[PDB]
From a paper:
We also mutated residue Cys26 in the active site to Ser to avoid potential autoprocessing and determined the crystal structure of procathepsin H C26S mutant at 1.66 Å resolution. The wild type and mutant structures are essentially identical with an RMSD of 0.14 Å for all Cα atoms. Ligand/ion in the structure of C26S mutant: N-acetyl-D-glucosamine, β-D-mannopyranose, α-D-mannopyranose, sulfate ion, chloride ion, trehalose. The helical subdomain is positioned on top of the right domain of the mature domain while the C-terminal extended portion traverses the substrate binding cleft toward the N-terminus of the mature domain, preventing access of the substrates to the active site. The mini-chain (Glu76P-Thr83P) in procathepsin H connects the N-terminal helical subdomain and the C-terminal linker in the prodomain, and is located right above the active site cleft of the mature domain. It is largely solvent-exposed and, except for the disulfide bond between Cys80P and Cys212, makes limited water mediated hydrogen bond interactions with the residues lining the cleft. However, these three catalytic residues in procathepsin H are shielded by a group of hydrophobic residues Tyr72P, Leu73P, Trp74P from the prodomain, which effectively blocks the access to the catalytic Cys and prevents external substrates from entering the binding site. Structural comparison with cathepsin H revealed that the mini-chain in procathepsin H runs in the direction opposite to that of the substrates while the mini-chain in cathepsin H follows the substrate binding direction, suggesting that the negatively charged C-terminal carboxyl group in the mini-chain of cathepsin H is positioned to interact with the N-terminal amino group of the substrate whereas the cleaved mini-chain in procathepsin H needs to reorient to be involved in such interaction. In addition to the proteolytic processing of the prodomain, the activation of procathepsin H requires the reorientation and repositioning of the mini-chain along the active site in the substrate-binding direction from the direction opposite to a bound substrate.
Author numbering: 24 to 335
The structure:
């Protein structure tokens, strides 16, 4: 039990108003305790020496158990694979890449809501980018179609799934509709796929060999953004800026629980990093993005990377 000071109390009242919360007296006391515990963790972290900072955001009054249940995948996915098809060529590669800078090649940051559907945003993001790079047209593709319709490829809607499996679904389904015709609901619904309204199509799926992080570097440098999955832990939820790293996340395929999109890479103060688009809205992290340490299979990010070749 924490003794909450007036500074924390006043800021929680502001946070509740900003995030449109209503709590009973009883739940309020519990939510305040969680908020104050996270407040102290953020300050303890930022007051020390680390490569990234933490901050308040929409997750600040949630326990990590609640966050896992609502926002992350509910069970291990079939990330481990003994077969792959991507074969890396030869470096060196450019010292830095950022597909947001090369042109209009990365779609805006979206919000998955309280649904474990990050695999769908990783998938649409990678395919949106691949189509924009190939044809110069930026589309917004329907994550909801993947949530509702991709179960024959071992995906599980709001309980989880994998980008490579979702790319295969789009290939054999003969395409994916736009957000405009198939809006995102943040919950599992009936499949409403209409063949004549598909606007995005997959020709091939590239699966990067397990732990082949240097192939991810080549793919981002030469071809396009790359979907990947990693293990989110408690302190990642509170990431604000800088280069994320952790000594407590696992690095194995059976522990990854969130999928995202690598859109570039770089280095700061001798620390290599990935530039990564998330799906928790544009005010999480660095305008919806984060940096994560590169070259260490950090949090298992090289366990099951993949990207699509579009049919255009
Ligand atoms: C990269 O990683 C992904 C994800 O793990 C792997 O995805 C698998 O990809 C294979 C193709 O390589 C997929 O298998 C194909 O599925 C198609 C759809 O199957 C459904 O529909 C048919 C009827 O049309 C049903 O019979 C079936 O039960 C399903 O309901 C099939 O149409 C394909 O069949 C064709 O190929 C097979 C042999 O491959 C022949 O037997 C057939 O006659 C036909 O020619 C095929 O089965 C599979 O669904 C994907 N799995 C998942 C979980 O997504 C990639 O393989 C992987 N790539 C590499 C290189 O590692
Ligand atoms: O979200 C928790 C539930 O997930 C599954 O149910 C959802 O997904 C089904 C398709 O996989 C939909 O048919 C169902 O309508 C959704 O609620 C799971 O089947 C449930 O047991 C979980 O409670
Ligand atoms: O053997 C399983 C481990 O493979 C990877 O680590 C090896 O390969 C890396 C480059 O892909 C090297 O940097 C690392 O030094 C090697 O140990 C993977 O990163 C590890 O998590 C796996 O355990
Ligand atoms: C993994 O693949 C196996 C074999 O196809 C399947 O039975 C199982 O449901 C899959 N697991 C998940 C979490 O998709
Ligand atoms: Cl520098
Ligand atoms: Cl910033």
């Amino acid at each position: 039990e924490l003794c909450v000071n007036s500074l924390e109390k006043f800021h929680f009242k502001s946070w509740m108003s900003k995030h449109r919360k209503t709590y009973s007296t009883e739940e309020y006391h519990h939510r305040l305790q969680t908020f104050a515990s996270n407040w102290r963790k953020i300050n303890a972290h930022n007051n020390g020496n680390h490569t990234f900072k933490m901050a308040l955001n929409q997750f600040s009054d949630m326990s990590f158990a609640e966050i896992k249940h609502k926002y992350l995948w509910s069970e291990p996915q079939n990330c481990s694979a003994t077969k792959s098809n991507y074969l890396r060529g030869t470096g060196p590669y450019p010292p830095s890449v950022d597909w947001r800078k090369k042109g209009n090649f990365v779609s805006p940051v979206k919000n998955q809501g309280a649904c474990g559907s990050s695999w769908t945003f990783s998938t649409t993001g990678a395919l949106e980018s691949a189509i924009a790079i190939a044809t110069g047209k930026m589309l917004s593709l329907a994550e909801q179609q993947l949530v509702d319709c991709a179960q024959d490829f071992n995906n599980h809607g709001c309980q989880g799934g994998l980008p490579s499996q979702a790319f295969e679904y789009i290939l054999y389904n003969k395409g994916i509709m736009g957000e405009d015709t198939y809006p995102y609901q943040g919950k599992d619904g009936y499949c409403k796929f209409q063949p004549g309204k598909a606007i995005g199509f997959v020709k091939d799926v590239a699966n990067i060999t397990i732990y082949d992080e240097e192939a991810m570097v080549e793919a981002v440098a030469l071809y396009n953004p790359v979907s990947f999955a990693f293990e989110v832990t408690q302190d990642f939820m509170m990431y604000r800026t800088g280069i994320y790293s952790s000594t407590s996340c696992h690095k194995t395929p059976d522990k990854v629980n969130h999928a995202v999109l690598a859109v570039g890479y770089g280095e700061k103060n001798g620390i290599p990093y990935w530039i990564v688009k998330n799906s928790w809205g544009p005010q999480w992290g660095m305008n919806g993005y984060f940096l994560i340490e590169r070259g260490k299979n950090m949090c298992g990010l090289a366990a099951c990377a993949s990207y699509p070749i579009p049919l255009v």
